[PDB]
């Protein structure tokens, strides 16, 4: 389009004349240059799926994990920039730790998401720092509150989601999660669906190799967030390969 | 600094404030127009007490003003902790103008866009003072602030005399606002405070209404 050189877009501490903070927008545009993480909550849990790109055949096949355990009942699927995403993994992890140490129980999702979206927001109004270039989904399950899936963008806004998608093919992933009855499915159907939606939105002629990472939390894991078994993962792989055809 | 002159540009865009030092007191009338009928005019106050004997009023930027209202009241009560005596008005203006000067020396901040009219009564003797955003303070017989303060300062220079009473000084402080009001003032859209020997108080709108009826 056209560039701007007046310099309203050089610090997050500055509005534009039409009222935008462009550094937050440019950080959010760093997220849409990254591969797609999807998250779907169901009747009994939240399922995460990341197309983790493998940009060298020399890595250890499990390097650069974009799925995080931030508490034993909450998990974190990241898009965007990894080093900022690991910083926020440490922040969310420390915030869960401090909540348990001060109040005596596990941090609620919707409270973890708010307390981490406030950190992400506090890095969006100063000239001494820049906004984070990662959007991320937090997904939990417990017995009292059900499945909980929030996503936090670089702006610092956290909304609840039945399905969610962050990354470069997030929109067609919103389409193919919108073709899905997630409010009635169980977690073991949502893993097949997450795998096939990740295999649909993956353009092999631009980025050509990836490793699908899945993580669930739910009734079937006793409200613990885990990577999930390789057997269930490779059945989801085979259903996604055959499903695509 | 250039920000001090640009901060005085935000004062002269503010609403008119007029303060007149009578023989037995000091008035401080201001312009308080509401932008629409939706605003509760009872809510926010421009004439504001600092002590039981010092009040003040401003022109310019209200949020900047409340920062020095809060800090004038703190400096006054930390004088009262030390001396158990109500602070002299001139001493308080030195303290407040020192605060208002601090935000011009330090970088990374701007000056206040507010100029204060500090009134007072101490030792049986009234005081009229103006603190500028530079941190400079001047003692006055009468002065104007805000929008067309120049025309107000020469309207006052014509109607000021030293053997003037407090009620007549309320009458000629309403007139100095009325020379620039633009559209028929009432008791709900100006705000007057007086010092006298009884202390500072902000006039009740029922008491402003009779002063307006006398004109």
């Amino acid at each position: 389009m056209s560039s701007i050189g007046t310099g309203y877009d050089l610090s997050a501490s500055t509005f534009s004349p039409d009222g935008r903070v462009f550094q937050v927008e440019y950080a959010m545009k760093a997220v849409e240059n990254s591969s797609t993480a999807i998250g779907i909550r169901c009747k009994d849990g939240v399922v995460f799926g990341v197309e983790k790109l493998v940009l060298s055949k020399l890595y250890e096949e499990g390097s650069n994990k974009r799925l995080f355990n931030v508490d034993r009942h909450v998990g974190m699927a990241v898009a965007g920039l990894l080093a900022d995403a690991r910083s926020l993994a440490d922040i969310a992890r420390e915030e869960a730790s401090n909540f348990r140490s001060n109040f005596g129980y596990n941090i609620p999702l919707k409270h973890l998401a708010d307390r981490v979206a406030m950190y992400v927001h506090a890095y969006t109004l100063y000239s001494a720092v820049r906004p984070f270039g990662c959007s991320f989904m937090l997904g939990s399950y417990s017995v009292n509150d059900g499945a909980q899936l929030y996503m936090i963008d670089p702006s610092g806004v956290s909304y609840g989601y039945w399905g969610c998608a962050i990354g470069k093919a997030r929109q067609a992933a919103k389409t193919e999660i919108e073709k899905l009855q997630m409010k009635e499915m169980t977690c073991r159907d949502i893993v097949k669906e997450v795998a096939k939606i990740i295999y649909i939105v993956h353009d092999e002629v631009k980025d050509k190799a990836f490793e699908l990472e899945l993580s669930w939390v739910g009734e079937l894991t006793n409200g613990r967030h885990e990577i999930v078994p390789k057997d269930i993962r490779e059945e989801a792989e085979k259903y996604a390969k055959e499903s695509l055809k | 600094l250039v920000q001090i002159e640009y901060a005085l540009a935000a004062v002269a865009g503010g609403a008119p404030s007029v303060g007149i030092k009578a023989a037995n007191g000091v008035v401080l009338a201001t312009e308080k127009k509401q932008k629409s009928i939706l605003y509760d005019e009872r809510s926010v106050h421009k004439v504001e007490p600092i002590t039981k004997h010092i009040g003040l009023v401003y022109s310019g930027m209200g949020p900047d003003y409340r920062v020095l209202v809060h800090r004038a009241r703190k400096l006054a009560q930390q004088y009262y902790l030390v001396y158990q005596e109500p602070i002299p008005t001139a001493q308080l203006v030195q303290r407040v103008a020192s605060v208002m000067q601090e935000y011009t020396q330090s970088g990374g901040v701007r000056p206040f866009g507010v100029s204060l009219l500090i009134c007072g009564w101490n030792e049986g003797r009234p005081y009229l003072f103006q603190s500028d955003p530079s941190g400079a303070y001047f003692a006055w017989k009468a002065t104007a602030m805000g929008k067309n303060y120049v025309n107000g300062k020469t309207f006052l220079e014509k109607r000021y005399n030293e053997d003037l009473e407090l009620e007549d000084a309320i009458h000629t402080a309403i007139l100095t606002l009325k020379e620039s009001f633009e559209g028929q003032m009432t008791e709900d859209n100006i705000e007057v405070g007086i010092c006298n020997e009884a202390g500072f108080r902000r006039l009740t709108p029922t008491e402003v209404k009779d002063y307006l009826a006398a004109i």
């Binding site: 039409d18 109004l125 899936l149 909304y159 | 920000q3 949020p63 809060h70 701007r110």
Partner: protein, 237 residues
Amino acid sequence: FDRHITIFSPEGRLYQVEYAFKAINQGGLTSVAVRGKDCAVIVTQKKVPDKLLDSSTVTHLFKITENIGCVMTGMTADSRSQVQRARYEAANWKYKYGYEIPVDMLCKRIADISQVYTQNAEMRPLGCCMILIGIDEEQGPQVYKCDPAGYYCGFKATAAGVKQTESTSFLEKKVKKKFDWTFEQTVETAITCLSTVLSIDFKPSEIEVGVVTVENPKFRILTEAEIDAHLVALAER
């Protein structure tokens, strides 16, 4: 750099403070608060653009204390941050001072915090608007609104957002004509005002109403069946 940070223009203006009000309009949403004889309502619209989003989490109505509520308009993360700061100042007033914070004192406190953003150059103004409602023990219903400039005022009615000026024109023609009051009319006035300037003939999944009354000062967020009970009563007249 005279238009990048919060310092004065040569004609005495703060351009970043002016651009924070432009930032309020970025949200696309308009909020309206009106005040009655023994009640004060807040109505905002609840445009949910993504249909696989949990709509129970998208809300601009916030509980500050049990007796004080809040509608936010503007940049959403800024809004949640200013809500957390208002909740802190309310609880700390109750702790230090032994009684519940008044609505004017909370709104004055949040505006005093916002002035600091308008004066230090190292951080920006926080580009959103708070409207606080709550029942005063001596003055009745209070509607207070603080802007990113650090101003606050008390309002017979007010509006915040994209269609603020036309909502203000509507309510200004309204409150000089009648003294709008009663529990039902004041929700009527705040639903009609939002509807007239948005011109979209509400269904209750699309707005959200928050009330305080003198008879029960608890801040309530209206149920969708209750917004139906007002929209059906308004939509046949």
